[PDB]
Write a protein that binds this DNA or RNA. Structure first.
Ligand SMILES: [Mg+2]
Ligand SMILES: [Mg+2]
Ligand SMILES: [Zn+2]
Length: 1207
RNA sequence: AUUUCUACUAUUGUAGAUUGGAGCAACACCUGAAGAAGGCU
RNA sequence: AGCCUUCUUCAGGUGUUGCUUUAGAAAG
DNA sequence: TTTTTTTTTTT
DNA sequence: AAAAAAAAAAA
């Protein structure tokens, strides 16, 4: 029943909030009762916030780091000179894996640590820890120095720009090196490592340690931090802090990913490759790769993806993961690290058949090279040889191409046409050589003429003849250079897409998409989980949430820096139960913590376990069967009862009061049941109180007080209107259903120059990115990791979709549901028709409009809504859901109200239309102009020569830019925007032709934000209509996956193939490319399906489509069968075949119809016309007004008719 | 005016949408280079 | 010797379509 | 039952 | 109507 529509999946959600107070006069003041401390903390945070320059900076930082490393390497073992603070000693005892003991001094000299722990002196653990850090940072110094010297010699010679390393690996190698160096430098500069025994005079023999004890390490710290902040700033946001609200997580160690690393290495079959390839030299590994059968190894799915990759295209292993990986796999296997590094450097060594034939023609073989490499060489050199003598192995190339295609390639009309076009291009290039004209141009003119008159086309190209006439007219008579250049460019576009199109080669390239994607995926995951080893400090701050009497909420976070004192303790000791400010913490527990408590207990003779409080006296603990046999020992009942006893009756359970979580392990007969109970129940929002004097003492001690701000929690009247603010106020009810994750990150965005302080981009914006979790409390819920496991397997995903829509169809079978069909297009971006379950068209939708009403008291100005129309089948293009001032949710047509030409002009009239597809049309025109600025810059600059009028400027654009493809041609061209762009380009070129300034103009504007925002309006409409029918509905969509024919690109005139010609061609993306990147079909699908899986009803999440992550999780699903029409059920959403939805009569169901010039549907076999809307018909067929209405009606009707038979 | 996006208003704002961080793969063009082939003077 | 076109490769930038990983306490 | 054409759109 | 042609479904 209705419980089939509740959510059983755990969901993560990021709720970003502002952390900077806007101080305008048109912004309501908030956070007033701690405003002085907020200002103090903001001044404190503002102080410590921010390829040739980057690498000069990297060289200086590298030299300073090497100097520090060489000096520190001779001093770390000097226990008679080094001392540590007490809190730094406690953190060291955690990090170096020894027991701190009891210390009665505030400054603990390492000479005083003569006590023996587990067979070694206490200071020997510290010295061994520093030696291990020195070794690790020495390795990463070598690794970073290699890349730095490579990229330096690349920049210092102009001839070596092809030798630059990958920038991502350069940045990440420096980040690891910076972490390892900072591990020593930050305590040294903080004073946590000091040299107290130095005041005595030993300058004649101890000058090195005296010099090192004073170096002002804050300078090296600042340089490292500056480079770190430069690297970490992506998208305008720089990471600032990582704050935790659970203080048991503040001293977190890096997570160990050894099982995932081993599994990924096992998937790569990397160990077998190193075994077969070690002992070989570099030329011997090259010979091994040369002797492979490329085609059979490429199609053998049981090979390494590394080997399968190297036999289509050369792809080296990335630098950082290769150096981490060789060191990881060498020492366990008994191998030398240099030998395995030599093996990994030789994988993907790029080799050129043209170069190899140039140097030595004997022993040459095209079978030595990858398929794409040898194909490119053979194809290009065979195409040239049809008209001239070319130094290349002709018979070998012919055999190679014939073996791929199964026919004689040099006789194929496609290859012959390619060779003809290439010969024409060559002779034109001879005639165009302005530096050196030929002395006898008639030879090349006659060559071009004879080549054009002898071309046999392999297929029909309608515009080839006019290109031929333009080129021939310019070379013979010289009429018009513009049409000649356009024809030459279009023949270049024709020639470019001609290569490989004689289906086997397309199949191989489509396979390489998946193969190289798997290769990159696995190496990126391995790189990410190797970097975690050196992520020593993960939590930077410990914080609490503070609330005052006005419900303004703050974050008070203390930095966990190495000092004399404990910071977690200095906050926790200032909380009372009788003070004036409310405080919140997260008290929680996970199975992730439980496994770390279980597996890391030590039961040896001399050791003192950090986890001895968790472990009781029951018999279930066996260290050998926990370390070596965990997956088999965890299914024993003795371990289950031991873990239950540890969770119920241990010292940790009684000190931390785990009885407050309300666990019940009586029905838990497994370890996984215990995990599920802990994950479902272990959350509390712990409320204490703090005083203003305590906050005052903490803020001058270095704590940061940040306000938590969004638009409607800091407004005058503070009703929650966004879903984020409703979620935010739902967290502080303390329920387990909706949780606050204890860990979150703080970032900042520096202001953009040219923006006022009144707008957010002229302001230093701090952002707190809180994470919320939806954990279902009603039964067996499904966690995030299980979801990731299911999304990676397509068969499990198919089974899950099948069972989900089985429950869905059972729930709705006997109810009076409706079917909502949505058509998609360009004239109407979406059209919506609701059908009764017997097929009757439903709908008397009230369509509203807005007027802004100025009030006498100016703060009381508001919008008023009046009903404008009544519509049955809805064009969703210009509609949006609005809440009126009375609180009623209505449908408003945004196009019925005019907007103002200039913003913030209250006394001006509104005169401009507000159609939403015109926005997409204008952005497409802007992107087309930018593309032509990149490729045809002089043709773009010629549009504004003699200061043309708007009409002449329009007709000059039409010879350069193609039309949008819907409506009248060039109907809404953004003339004033485009002319300003061309003027700015002309200004930049006149000021010295700087490339960065040009890139700020000619690079394509992103289309995703605009069409996401436009789609979101229609998604809100569909959610409103779905809620209107009490969620008893099915949604019917077209399966727009197949392209029936070709298209032309929106950027060039370039041909786009069909799905029959290239199996990976999608109709939605072909339509996207035709519109120069402004198609909204897939955005509509993805946003609708993401809306339908997390629908809110005021406290509860309702799920209507199955769980999915990627686009291949709702695509690639089973089809419903034994039905009238083909359909793919995805929950309540059905994807029907789009065939004969627009070309069908609503009355007689015949397909001999046509759409009139006004998009009126006319039937040629029964006289039906959509213009006769006053003649009432059965099933409200007279509601259909267009061909889009007809398409939406038939989209709904196919799903209606197969839902009748299906249930 | 915004956590942010889209459309607005000038209402100490309004309406809808909103899961963030780091990346990987293919394609398009631009910029900096290299190798090869053929051609011109 | 100077230069041109063509093909391929390397690095980056910007777009377009996709796909992963990460997001609660680690002693042999 | 075979076969061709069907989602998009304009001049 | 067209338009470098596959699987679904009209005749
Ligand atoms: Mg449609
Ligand atoms: Mg349509
Ligand atoms: Zn009819």
């Amino acid at each position: 029943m209705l419980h089939a529509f509740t959510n059983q999946y755990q969901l993560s959600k990021t709720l970003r909030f502002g952390a900077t107070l806007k101080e305008d006069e048109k912004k309501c003041k908030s956070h007033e009762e701690l405003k002085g401390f907020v200002d103090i903390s903001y001044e404190n945070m503002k102080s410590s916030a921010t390829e040739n320059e980057l690498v000069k900076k990297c060289e200086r930082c590298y030299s300073e780091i090497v100097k520090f490393h060489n000096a520190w390497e001779k001093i770390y073992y000097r226990t008679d000179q080094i001392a540590v603070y007490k809190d730094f000693y406690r953190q060291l005892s955690r990090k170096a894996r020894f027991d701190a003991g009891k210390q009665n001094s505030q400054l603990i000299t390492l000479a005083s640590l003569c006590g023996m722990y587990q067979g070694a002196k206490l200071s020997r653990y510290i010295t061994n820890y520093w030696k291990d850090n020195i070794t690790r940072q020495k390795s990463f110094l070598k690794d970073f120095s290699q890349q730095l010297h490579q990229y330096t010699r690349a920049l210092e010679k102009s001839d070596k720009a092809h030798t630059k390393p990958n920038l991502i690996n350069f940045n990440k190698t420096f980040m690891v090196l910076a972490n390892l160096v900072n591990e020593i430098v930050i305590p040294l500069s903080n004073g946590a490592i000091s040299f107290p025994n130095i005041s005595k005079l030993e300058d004649g023999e101890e000058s090195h340690l005296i010099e090192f004890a004073l170096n002002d390490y804050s300078q090296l710290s600042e340089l490292i931090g500056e480079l770190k902040d430069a690297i970490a700033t992506n998208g305008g946001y720089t990471p600032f802090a990582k704050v935790t609200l659970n203080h048991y997580t503040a001293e977190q160690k890096p997570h160990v990913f050894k099982n995932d690393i081993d599994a990924k290495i096992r998937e790569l079959k990397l160990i077998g490759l190193v075994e077969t390839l070690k002992g070989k030299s570099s030329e011997q590994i090259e010979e091994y790769f040369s002797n492979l059968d490329k085609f059979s190894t490429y199609n053998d799915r049981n090979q390494s993806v590394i080997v399968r990759t190297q036999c289509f295209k050369y792809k080296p292993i990335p630098f950082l993961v290769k150096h981490q990986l060789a060191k990881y796999i060498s020492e366990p296997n008994g191998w030398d690290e240099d030998a395995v590094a030599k093996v990994l450097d030789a994988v993907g060594a790029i080799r050129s058949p043209a170069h190899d034939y140039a140097n030595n023609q004997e022993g040459f073989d095209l079978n030595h090279y990858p398929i794409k490499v040898a194909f490119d060489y053979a194809w290009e050199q065979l195409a040239n040889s049809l008209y001239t003598t070319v130094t290349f192995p002709q018979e070998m190339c012919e055999k190679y191409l014939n073996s791929i295609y199964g026919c004689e390639v040099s006789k194929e009309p496609v290859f012959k046409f390619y060779a003809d076009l290439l010969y024409i291009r060559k002779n034109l290039a001879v005639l165009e050589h302005k530096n050196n004209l030929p002395s006898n141009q008639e030879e090349f003119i006659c060559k071009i003429n004879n080549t054009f008159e002898n071309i046999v086309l392999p297929y029909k190209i309608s515009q080839f003849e006019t290109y031929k006439k333009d080129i021939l007219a310019w070379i013979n008579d010289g009429h018009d250079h513009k049409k000649y250049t356009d024809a030459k460019q279009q023949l270049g576009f024709i020639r470019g897409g001609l290569k490989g199109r004689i289906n086997p080669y397309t199949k191989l390239t489509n396979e390489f998409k998946q193969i190289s994607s798997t290769y990159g995926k696995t190496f990126a995951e391995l790189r990410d989980k190797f970097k975690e080893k050196n992520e020593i400090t993960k939590i930077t701050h410990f914080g609490i949430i503070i609330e005052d009497k006005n419900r303004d909420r703050y974050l008070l976070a203390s930095e966990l820096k190495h000092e004399q004192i404990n910071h977690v303790s200095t906050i926790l000791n200032k909380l009372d139960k009788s003070s004036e400010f409310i405080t919140y913490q997260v008290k929680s527990l996970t199975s992730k913590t439980l496994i770390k408590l279980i597996k890391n207990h030590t039961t040896k003779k001399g050791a003192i376990s950090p986890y001895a409080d968790f472990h009781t006296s029951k018999t279930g603990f066996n260290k050998n069967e926990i370390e070596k046999n965990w997956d088999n020992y965890k299914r024993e009942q003795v371990l289950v009862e031991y873990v239950k006893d540890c969770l119920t009756d241990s010292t940790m359970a009684k000190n931390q009061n785990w009885a407050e979580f309300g666990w019940n392990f009586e029905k838990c007969n497994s370890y996984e049941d215990i995990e599920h109970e802990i994950d479902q129940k272990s959350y509390l929002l712990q409320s204490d109180t703090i005083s203003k004097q305590s906050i005052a003492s903490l803020v001058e001690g270095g704590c940061l007080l940040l306000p938590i701000i969004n638009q409607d929690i800091t407004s005058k009247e503070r009703k929650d209107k966004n879903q984020f603010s409703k979620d935010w106020n739902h967290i502080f009810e303390g329920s387990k259903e909706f949780r606050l994750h204890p860990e979150f990150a703080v970032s900042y965005r520096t202001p953009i120059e040219g923006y006022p302080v009144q707008k957010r981009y002229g302001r230093l914006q701090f952002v707190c990115a809180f994470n919320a979790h939806i954990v279902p409390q009603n039964g067996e819920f499904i966690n995030l990791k299980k979801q990731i496991e299911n999304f990676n397997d397509e068969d499990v995903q198919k089974r899950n979709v099948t069972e989900f829509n089985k429950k869905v169809n059972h729930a709705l079978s006997d109810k009076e549901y409706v079917v909502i069909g949505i058509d998609r297009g360009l004239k109407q971006l979406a059209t919506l028709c609701v059908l009764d379950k017997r097929g009757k068209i439903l709908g008397d939708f009230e369509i509203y409009k807005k007027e802004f009403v100025r009030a006498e008291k100016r703060s009381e100005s508001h919008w008023e809504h009046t009903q404008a129309e009544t519509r049955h089948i809805l064009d969703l293009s210009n509609l949006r859901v609005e809440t009126t001032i009375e609180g009623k949710k209505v449908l408003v047509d945004q196009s019925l109200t005019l907007v103002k030409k200039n913003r913030d002009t209250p006394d001006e009239e509104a005169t401009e239309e507000n159609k939403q597809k015109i926005k997409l049309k204008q952005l497409s025109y802007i992107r087309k102009l930018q593309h032509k600025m990149q490729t045809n810059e002089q043709d773009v600059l010629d549009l504004i020569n003699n200061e043309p009028s708007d009409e002449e400027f329009k007709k000059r654009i039409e010879g350069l830019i193609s039309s949008f493809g819907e409506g009248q041609k060039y109907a809404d061209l953004p003339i004033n925007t485009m002319r300003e762009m061309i003027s700015d380009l002309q200004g930049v070129i006149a000021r010295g032709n700087n490339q960065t300034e040009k890139n700020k103009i000619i690079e394509l504007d992103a289309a995703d934000n605009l069409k996401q925002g436009i789609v979101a309006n229609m998604i809100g409409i569909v959610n409103y209509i779905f809620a209107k029918y009490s969620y008893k509905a099915y949604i019917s969509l077209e399966d727009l996956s197949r392209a029936y024919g070709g298209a032309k690109s929106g950027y060039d005139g370039r041909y786009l193939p069909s799905t029959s010609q290239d199996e990976d061609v999608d109709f939605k993306e072909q339509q996207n490319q035709m519109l120069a990147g402004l198609g909204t079909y897939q955005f509509f699908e993805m946003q609708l399906l993401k809306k339908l899986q997390k629908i809110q009803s005021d406290n509860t999440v309702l799920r209507f489509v199955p769980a999915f992550r990627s686009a291949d999780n709702y695509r690639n699903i089973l089809r419903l069968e034994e039905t009238k029409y083909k359909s793919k059920p995805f929950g309540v959403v059905h994807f029907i075949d789009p065939k004969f939805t627009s070309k069908k009569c609503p009355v007689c169901s015949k397909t001999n119809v046509y759409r009139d010039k006004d998009d009126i549907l006319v039937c040629k076999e029964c006289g039906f016309r959509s213009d006769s809307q006053l003649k009432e018909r059965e099933n409200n067929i007279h509601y259909i007004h267009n061909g889009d209405d007809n398409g939406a009606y038939h989209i709904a009707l196919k799903s209606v008719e197969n839902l009748i038979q299906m249930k």
